[PDB]
């Protein structure tokens, strides 16, 4: 299939291929998230116009996505346009919208090539803030590449994490209002499935280029246990070796980060069990029943409490997925 424009690439060189085989003997990330920062500074550095920096920045995204595929990293998430970026000048915002119109739209025309390689394109954000035509181009690309499995690019556009989290709560609130949810069903696990990223596992790595050491409202919930890598390089100058260094950072953190991630999950489940047992106890000392009977009343009520919750959640998620799939464009 040669190369798409979102985009294709050549194989790894000898040294890149060698180092890849070495680090592939240890834990590898399944999902990397990039804050693509420093385009404008790069334009000023190369005496090019700001629009040229952003367009070069898109080229680097296509190149970096090829490196990830050549490393067997099949899911990538990128911060392409923040809601805060709407505060930039009309000339720059229009330049970014026109780029997105041009790179999308080229996604079509390159259809079939996306279907040949199973490339799923997801675009995450408060997309009602984008120009209507850009929304329709986005929707077509997302609708066309759905049901594709081989790899996954999540383009965060008109996105912030706080807007994403509050939307996830709104979705759960709608569930309660619709009768699909009880307020007690709300959970960290359920909130996770209400995020824009709910078809993706949390990133193993979060990379931010240029010298900035902050998250800038990107995947705050998703990266709470992710390896964080801040590299001074400007995004349009990103190399395979910057990516390699980041993966190396992840491998050195992996054992601690895994154990902490696992200890956090076990502690949350432990406290959730304690909470459910206390609920069952309260309902039982209300009324006249007891908690330590041979009848195992507590245990039957605990199983029904959790089964009804899971049944209500599965119904809500299915309705949420039906609402999310429902789209003119």
């Amino acid at each position: 299939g040669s190369g798409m424009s979102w985009i294709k690439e050549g194989e790894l060189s000898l040294w890149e291929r060698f180092c890849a085989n070495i680090i592939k003997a240890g834990p590898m990330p399944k999902h990397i998230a990039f804050i693509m920062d420093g385009n404008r500074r790069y334009a000023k550095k190369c005496q090019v116009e700001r629009q040229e920096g952003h367009s070069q920045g898109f080229n680097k995204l296509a190149e970096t996505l090829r490196w990830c595929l050549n490393l067997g990293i099949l899911e990538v998430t990128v911060y392409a346009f923040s809601i805060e970026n709407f505060k930039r000048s009309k000339s720059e915002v229009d330049g970014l919208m026109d780029l997105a119109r041009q790179k999308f739209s080229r996604l079509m025309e390159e259809k079939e090539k996306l279907q040949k390689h199973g490339v799923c394109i997801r675009v995450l954000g408060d997309l009602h803030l984008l120009p209507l035509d850009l929304q329709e181009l986005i929707a077509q690309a997302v609708q066309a590449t759905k049901n594709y499995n081989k790899c996954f690019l999540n383009v965060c556009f008109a996105y912030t994490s706080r807007h994403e989290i509050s939307n996830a709560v709104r979705e759960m609130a709608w569930g309660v209002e619709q009768g699909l949810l009880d307020p007690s069903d709300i959970s960290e696990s359920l909130l996770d499935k209400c995020l824009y990223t709910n078809r993706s596992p949390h990133p193993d790595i979060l990379i931010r280029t240029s010298g900035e050491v902050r998250l800038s409202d990107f995947l705050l919930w998703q990266t709470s246990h992710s390896c964080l890598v801040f590299q001074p390089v400007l995004w349009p100058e990103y190399t395979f070796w910057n990516l390699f260094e980041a993966i190396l950072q992840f491998q050195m953190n992996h054992s601690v980060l895994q154990k902490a991630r696992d200890m956090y999950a076990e502690e949350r489940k432990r406290q959730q069990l304690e909470r459910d047992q206390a609920t069952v106890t309260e309902q039982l000392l209300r009324e006249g029943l007891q908690a330590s009977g041979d009848a195992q009343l507590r245990r039957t009520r605990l199983h029904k409490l959790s089964a009804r919750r899971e049944e209500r959640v599965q119904g809500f998620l299915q309705a949420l997925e039906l609402k999310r799939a429902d789209w003119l464009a």
Binding site: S166, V169, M172, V176, S187, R214, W221, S224, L228, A260
Partner: protein, 197 residues
């Protein structure tokens, strides 16, 4: 001499281009139990140079389960006792993972219950109102997080609140010097937040 030390720390904080209103201390080191005297020094240094709020955090909840030993150590290093205790309680928060995601969940439960009681509509929940429910309601978000230890992760520290927080990393808190702490402040003071522009 006590007044001399106070004046120096005040001059130090006042000399920086900017000072964090709210600083977070994230301790990732798990090989050794955290050193309470070193944490207390950091906290006293923040208060002395003019920082309003200090949040102390570790992913294991060690500080939250040893709250009294940490306050006692903080009060000791400052040297009415009731007034100093009240001041430390207003400035210092001892956090653990439950103060992040688990508290966002608690706020969402509270809101959904209001929807259930016909008091609110799902469309009422916006970013501002979510922050109003967030148990950190009256407090500013952390401007600066000092991360100690070898883990390149915030390990669940206040995910909602660190959207703009500058994250400076130090290798260890174990024998932390005032110069090392002030170097971090100088780094934070040199940061420029363009807020999307």
């Amino acid at each position: 001499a006590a007044a001399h030390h106070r004046m120096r720390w005040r001059a130090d904080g006042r000399s920086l281009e900017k000072l964090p209103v709210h600083m977070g201390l994230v301790i990732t080191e798990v090989e050794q139990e955290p050193s309470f005297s070193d944490i207390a020094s950091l906290v006293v240094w923040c208060m002395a140079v003019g920082i309003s709020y200090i949040s102390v955090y570790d992913h294991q909840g060690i500080f939250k389960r040893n709250n009294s030993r940490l306050m006692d150590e903080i009060l000791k290093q400052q040297q009415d006792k009731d007034d100093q205790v009240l001041n430390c309680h207003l400035a210092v928060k001892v956090l653990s993972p439950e103060d992040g995601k688990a508290d966002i969940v608690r706020a969402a439960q509270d809101f959904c219950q209001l929807v259930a009681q016909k008091q609110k509509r799902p469309t009422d929940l916006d970013v501002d109102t979510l922050a109003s429910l967030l148990s950190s309601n009256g407090c500013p978000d952390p401007d600066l997080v000092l991360k100690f230890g070898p883990v390149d992760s915030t390990l669940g520290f206040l995910p909602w609140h660190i959207r703009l927080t500058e994250i400076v990393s130090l290798p260890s808190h174990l024998n932390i010097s005032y110069e090392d702490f002030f170097s971090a402040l100088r780094q934070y003071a040199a940061c420029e937040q363009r807020l999307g522009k």
